[PDB]
Amino acid sequence: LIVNVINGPNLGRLGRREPAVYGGTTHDELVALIEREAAELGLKAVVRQSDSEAQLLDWIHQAADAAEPVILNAGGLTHTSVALRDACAELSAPLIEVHISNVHAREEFRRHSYLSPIATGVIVGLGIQGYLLALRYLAEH
Amino acid sequence: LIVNVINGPNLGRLGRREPAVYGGTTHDELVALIEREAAELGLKAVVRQSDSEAQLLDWIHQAADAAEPVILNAGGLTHTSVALRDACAELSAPLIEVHISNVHAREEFRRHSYLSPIATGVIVGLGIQGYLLALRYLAEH
Amino acid sequence: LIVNVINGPNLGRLGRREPAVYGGTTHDELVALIEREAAELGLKAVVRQSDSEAQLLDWIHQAADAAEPVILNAGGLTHTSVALRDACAELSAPLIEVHISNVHAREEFRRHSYLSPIATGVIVGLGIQGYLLALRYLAEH
Amino acid sequence: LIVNVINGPNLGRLGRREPAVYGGTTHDELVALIEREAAELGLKAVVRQSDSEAQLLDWIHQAADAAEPVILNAGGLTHTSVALRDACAELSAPLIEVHISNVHAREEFRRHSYLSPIATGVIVGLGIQGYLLALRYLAEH
Amino acid sequence: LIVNVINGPNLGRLGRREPAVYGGTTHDELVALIEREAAELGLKAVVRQSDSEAQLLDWIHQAADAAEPVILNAGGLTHTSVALRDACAELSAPLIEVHISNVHAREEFRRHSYLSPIATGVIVGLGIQGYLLALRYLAEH
Amino acid sequence: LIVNVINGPNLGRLGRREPAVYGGTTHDELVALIEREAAELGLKAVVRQSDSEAQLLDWIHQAADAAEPVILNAGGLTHTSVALRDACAELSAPLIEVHISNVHAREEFRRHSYLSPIATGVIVGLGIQGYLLALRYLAEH
Amino acid sequence: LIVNVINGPNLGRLGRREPAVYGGTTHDELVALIEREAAELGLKAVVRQSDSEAQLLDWIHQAADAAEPVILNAGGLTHTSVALRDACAELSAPLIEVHISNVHAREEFRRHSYLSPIATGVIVGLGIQGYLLALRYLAEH
Amino acid sequence: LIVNVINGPNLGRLGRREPAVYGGTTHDELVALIEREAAELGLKAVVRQSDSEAQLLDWIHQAADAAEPVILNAGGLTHTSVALRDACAELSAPLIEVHISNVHAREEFRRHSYLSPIATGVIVGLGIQGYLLALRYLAEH
Amino acid sequence: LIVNVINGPNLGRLGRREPAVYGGTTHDELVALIEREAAELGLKAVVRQSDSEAQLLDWIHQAADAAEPVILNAGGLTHTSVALRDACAELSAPLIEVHISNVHAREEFRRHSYLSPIATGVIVGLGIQGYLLALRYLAEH
Amino acid sequence: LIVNVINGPNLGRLGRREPAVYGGTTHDELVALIEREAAELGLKAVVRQSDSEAQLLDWIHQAADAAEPVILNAGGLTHTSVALRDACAELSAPLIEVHISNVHAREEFRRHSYLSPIATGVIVGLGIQGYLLALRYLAEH
Amino acid sequence: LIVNVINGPNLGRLGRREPAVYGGTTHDELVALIEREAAELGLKAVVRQSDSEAQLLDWIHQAADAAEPVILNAGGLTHTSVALRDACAELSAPLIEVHISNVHAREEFRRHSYLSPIATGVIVGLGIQGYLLALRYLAEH
Amino acid sequence: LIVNVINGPNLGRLGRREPAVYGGTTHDELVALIEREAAELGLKAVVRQSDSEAQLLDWIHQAADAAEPVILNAGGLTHTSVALRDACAELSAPLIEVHISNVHAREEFRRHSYLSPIATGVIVGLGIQGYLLALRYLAEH
Ligand SMILES: O=C(O)[C@]1(O)C=C(CCO)[C@@H](O)[C@H](O)C1
Ligand SMILES: O=C(O)[C@]1(O)C=C(CCO)[C@@H](O)[C@H](O)C1
Ligand SMILES: O=C(O)[C@]1(O)C=C(CCO)[C@@H](O)[C@H](O)C1
Ligand SMILES: O=C(O)[C@]1(O)C=C(CCO)[C@@H](O)[C@H](O)C1
Ligand SMILES: O=C(O)[C@]1(O)C=C(CCO)[C@@H](O)[C@H](O)C1
Ligand SMILES: O=C(O)[C@]1(O)C=C(CCO)[C@@H](O)[C@H](O)C1
Ligand SMILES: O=C(O)[C@]1(O)C=C(CCO)[C@@H](O)[C@H](O)C1
Ligand SMILES: O=C(O)[C@]1(O)C=C(CCO)[C@@H](O)[C@H](O)C1
Ligand SMILES: O=C(O)[C@]1(O)C=C(CCO)[C@@H](O)[C@H](O)C1
Ligand SMILES: O=C(O)[C@]1(O)C=C(CCO)[C@@H](O)[C@H](O)C1
Ligand SMILES: O=C(O)[C@]1(O)C=C(CCO)[C@@H](O)[C@H](O)C1
Ligand SMILES: O=C(O)[C@]1(O)C=C(CCO)[C@@H](O)[C@H](O)C1
Ligand code: NA
Ligand code: NA
Ligand code: NA
Ligand code: NA
Ligand code: NA
Ligand code: NA
Ligand code: NA
Ligand code: NA
Ligand code: NA
Ligand code: NA
Ligand code: NA
Ligand code: NA
Ligand code: NA
Ligand code: NA
Ligand code: NA
Ligand code: NA
Ligand code: NA
Ligand code: NA
Ligand code: NA
Ligand code: NA
Ligand code: NA
Ligand code: NA
Ligand code: NA
Ligand code: NA
Ligand code: NA
Ligand code: NA
Ligand code: NA
Ligand code: NA
Ligand code: NA
Ligand code: NA
Ligand code: NA
Ligand code: NA
Ligand code: NA
Ligand code: NA
């Protein structure tokens, strides 16, 4: 029923660099697209964004306590934060890691994720439709 | 309209190991699920499997010449074949790389792909629904 | 006389995963155990926890200015934060690094600490008694 | 005209360790020196410091939206934060990375920067005059 | 009740280098301190030292057969001996690894231990009080 | 008073590749700019260039014997010559290492310098103004 | 009762290089020796060779479905094929990996095997008697 | 007299990607150019291409038995196949390895060849004339 | 005729850990099995075990002087001792290295042997039958 | 029309070591062979050799200014000199790198070249005919 | 006056392998040569050999307590023993490390020494005269 | 009879840094000491120094042609020059590599030598007596 979509650092800046990297959809448009899709699927999507690791951790803690699934795009913290990994390892419902860009076609440091080994699955490089596809996985799960 | 789904070595063996690793769906069931989904999406899915790298290359060559999109699960060749990478780099339509298992939760050698850097995107660890989600991306693309 | 016990990200979640990883004592129980032990030793323990690196840094800054000893369990930041290391290098009184779990029996990335080289000493894998043993070292120091 | 000087974790502690590492100038003195130099150059310097990555990111976001140049000394986050790198990659005006100490004469982990590849340039080991020299580059740019 | 304290190569030389590295307590004084503490705790400590790996192995074998806990400071063999690791993996009662010096502040080769992954826990850099603190852990265990 | 500016291999070729890499100023123009700036600062700049390591070493030897400061852009020898490093380690007055290009944005092999650890400081990626900024540091030093 | 002996690329060329590397027995002689030994042991040996990975995979698939033991000398694919590893991981009866030459005395790349971690055991450097010794292990198993 | 030219995976696709990578000559044109050159040199060139490793191995086996020289462009198998290396090590006449593209200017994984250490020589980056130049070496050999 | 079987550290402890790792046969049973097999083969087996490297070296020295073959299971010293390697390099008769467990399925540090490159051959993971199979190789040699 | 052949350190010593490494042709003979071939091709070859990096750089500078092609065998500087690489990157006409010996069959340090990534192409292991084959490429270019 | 010459594992076997590796002088001859040279120099040489690390450590301990210089050829323990390094770090008089063979021309693992960083100096590859040359250094020291 | 002593970059600067690194003997004093010792040994020592690699190479070439032994202290080129290695590999008489300082106690980059693998032997850390000891080896050779 309830799905948490959690976006990390810099994801509030969607639609401000060249559409080359992350597409032309803004974060507000993203929230709207996700909500619309979620309703069609008979889910409720709670979509939140923060540039603060501590805030992200608190959202993951609540999802852990509620046994709610998480779609998480951690931004740069994907590649650097053990703390985020430790919080996500508490989750009992599925965790789908999403990257808008194809990280495997960028710098080598983006090709490692602390989150992938503990996630249910990972979607990269399908732009913002990656979130919609994750919702749909969760609706069937 | 037409989408090629190409499965590589050992994928014909789906449903024969413990459902732990790859799920309980057989390859024939997979073909059927994909075809059914593709028709609902108004696509035609051509689904093929081989344990022979040369056969896989020939299928990729035809997709390149037809400018058709490919959903490719290369099995073990993901981690080892430059030749497959070179064939896939000719593709002008999208290439979505799919892994049934979450390779990031397994041996370290499964965490490298020669295909990811040239793919449009990658879906891992969502089981066979990963193919269905790729079809759906392509139907919107 | 005064000892600061500083816990970092996710340590507020003690007692919520399987007792396998970190034991069944909660953070509030931990505070209570530490305070009781500290009083028996004729010390005052100030025990604080935050998931925010900036808050942790500020607590370390105050300990540096007061020349007070610190028992620090930085959680995931142990393995990732140079900033925390830089703050701890100002400390003139002892710094004892504590890990509840035996990090050497877990993932390889947990086997590196930015803090160990600048700490007085390190206690790992003795569960929450690791804090009590650190207090006792400080009472004799 | 307007230049942002952004200092990251622990830079508020300038003048509190042995003058060996970072010199004897405090952060307030630094702000004053920079402002005085900036006025002589006919610039306005906005100088800000935070130990919070999220706050640093927000300052970089504003500089990106205003197309203003940034002189950035990220402290320990230089060596660890992809998120900071991603925010700085939006900047369209110059980015000069500054380190007070000669990081190349210290620990090996200080010899890598996530920021250098996307900066216009880098000044290290010239103490606080490194900021003044960056201002002067920007006044001619 | 019975605890074995086993010291490896060069530990008989305690109190002969500058107090900088290992302190000014000799091995005989160490035995005496440990015995006194053990009696206060209502334990019996059997404290033994050898520069011979084979002798150390035989002591570990006996502790394994008696199901007795071991506090082990293996000296240089910590970083080099698989054989010692294999003997210690038989132990069914706790194994606490102790280093007098903070190995993390010395040469990089001292930062790896073959023993840590199989030990219950590890205490480093607290000087000879590290042994006393291990005894106290065992008295509560 | 006297400052030596020493340029190494290929720096005589300034202004001959695309202005992309090193700018459009020639070496003769560079000498002129440096001299003009030095006079304004009340310094005398002795500016020399050679493609011969032995000649560079001899210039560094003379600066060492005269206790004169050196601004050194060693070209490709930055990344390869221990001999140059050994000569520069004799210098008792400051050594400022200068790179015209941002080496951190180029090939990985340009990101290591044998000179940085023994230099007073390093300026990269500020083009030829990097020399002028070094002069100004020295005038205040 | 039934044992499959599977030889991979280039093993059909036995007896054609200097007897230094692989001995002077041809593949046909090898088949004959194995059959003779197998009969003495009261086993039936099915001995097959191919330079085609796909053919090797199909033979391993059949052994998996029949629950038959495999003695496998994969030739160069030992060091390179994940696909072969994946097929061999299905085997429920024993898998003995055999190398005629002592791979540990040759190039470093021959010292890694994708098969060893999933094999029951490995025999190297005992020439063709390695096959006979594997048969004998299986006859007792 | 007789020279074998053997092309591996994807070389049948010459002239189908942008002329940037491999030139605009097709494989059929290549065969024709080689034959014409060979006749001028008084040689007979047997030119063959396959995407199948097993087929390539069989061609190398025949060249080994006939003591005929080989010009080999193995495509992606250059970087991945030990089996191909093992077959080529049987060759008693010269082996010239040819790459159309300059592999040293591409991805790092293309800069390693299993074939180079056992080849007589290697020609890279001279396009299809690399084959013609190899023929000419063999005509003088 | 005479074969030396030499077992190193911890091999006297066979049959004392879970049969999972090394089987349920004790060292005395092993000696008996080997002797019985050796007599059937018309050999004399001299079987010795020590936890002392110096004792092992002396046994290898005697085998070198007598030109007698050695079956050696060095235990943990396999992975760590150059001295043992140097002694074994004197042997003129065959040296067969034996491991009871499949070291390739355990920790990565067990996957390197200082002995394999100088051994005639290596048998791993066939339990105690590995010794019997080595005897049989030697009886035919 | 004009082609520069530039030989680096030790190439003046051709014909003085065992013909095993570099052949029996001296440098003077090499000059003569190249000149004769060049005339047959209707080219003029200017062939020069120096053990001085600075002299080599000056020759490359002149070829850059004249837009003349270079055949360069840099000797040991191939593997060590960034300065040479930087000079060769100015060349607008083709650069063919030549090695007489097959560097891939020698020490590992000879398998890296700073020149290959910026060269048009590379010929190794064809002895002195490698120069003649490069001339012929240039005559067709 | 008194100099200790300490030889480690396998050095008692001098003169038993091909004179290629270590020369044809036996250990007894070596003792005699050293004694004769020492007397000519007006020194007393105490020459001892053991294959037991513990015995070597005890000899080093005595040299440390007597403040006597040591010439040490540790054999294979050079490359493997931290314990030996720790004992040698107590020595206050000079420590000269000697290797008979040129370890730099052998396996790569022989090119690392735990002893070199703490030795006064090192002599390798001068055969047994290396000991005589060390004595002579000590006689002048 | 004749021995060449060849000193490389910066060795003309002996006696100008703190006696800590290289001692207080100047190069002229060194020449004098060597000559005096050589005469006592009935040798003639030709002692030469240059900061120019090309000059060093030419001296090594002459020693190769005269079949004269070389004592070589290459300075920083020890760690960086393949060209020097290639010249020294021609030498048929002994080559003794000498370092005044103990390079193993300094930076890690000084612990690799391109010369050691081809030298007869190596003396490090015995100061200038290292040259005298090399002469004496050569007088007995
Ligand atoms: O592609 C993504 O969605 C991504 O997770 C996002 C960011 C930051 C986006 O501004 C980057 O830090 C990640 O490396 C990739
Ligand atoms: O998870 C998958 O789908 C996968 O692509 C498939 C195989 C082989 C499946 O038998 C494995 O070789 C890959 O590592 C992962
Ligand atoms: O064992 C610990 O106490 C530890 O410091 C704590 C955490 C996070 C605890 O939730 C982990 O991030 C550390 O790796 C180990
Ligand atoms: O030298 C600097 O200015 C520096 O950026 C600052 C800090 C933290 C300063 O307390 C360190 O974390 C950096 O490694 C170096
Ligand atoms: O600090 C310790 O107690 C230590 O275990 C002891 C020794 C040898 C002590 O002489 C060293 O070999 C270890 O690296 C650290
Ligand atoms: O950017 C510079 O100034 C630099 O020092 C110069 C050269 C050579 C310039 O032709 C290059 O070799 C360095 O890598 C960068
Ligand atoms: O020694 C063997 O049997 C071996 O498996 C065989 C081959 C190919 C044999 O031609 C090689 O590819 C392997 O590295 C070793
Ligand atoms: O440049 C070549 O000729 C090359 O051998 C060919 C291929 C495949 C060509 O489609 C690539 O796989 C090689 O890396 C380079
Ligand atoms: O499997 C074996 O026989 C083995 O040689 C034995 C030991 C020690 C056995 O107690 C281990 O040290 C080796 O790694 C593996
Ligand atoms: O093979 C060659 O031509 C080569 O370029 C030449 C030399 C020096 C030749 O004396 C070596 O330094 C190179 O590694 C290989
Ligand atoms: O060359 C030597 O003297 C040496 O120290 C001796 C031995 C053992 C000699 O049998 C080897 O273990 C060392 O690697 C080299
Ligand atoms: O110790 C030596 O003699 C040495 O060869 C000399 C130099 C340069 C001396 O100024 C250094 O470059 C070497 O690393 C060490
Ligand atoms: Na919620
Ligand atoms: Na991970
Ligand atoms: Na999209
Ligand atoms: Na199709
Ligand atoms: Na890749
Ligand atoms: Na699924
Ligand atoms: Na406090
Ligand atoms: Na560290
Ligand atoms: Na506890
Ligand atoms: Na502003
Ligand atoms: Na980077
Ligand atoms: Na300053
Ligand atoms: Na006991
Ligand atoms: Na370990
Ligand atoms: Na203490
Ligand atoms: Na001057
Ligand atoms: Na350095
Ligand atoms: Na500029
Ligand atoms: Na069968
Ligand atoms: Na593996
Ligand atoms: Na055999
Ligand atoms: Na043919
Ligand atoms: Na290779
Ligand atoms: Na061409
Ligand atoms: Na015997
Ligand atoms: Na080895
Ligand atoms: Na068994
Ligand atoms: Na010319
Ligand atoms: Na390169
Ligand atoms: Na030739
Ligand atoms: Na003595
Ligand atoms: Na060391
Ligand atoms: Na000798
Ligand atoms: Na001479």
Ligand code: NA
């Ligand atoms: Na080398």
Ligand code: NA
């Ligand atoms: Na001296």
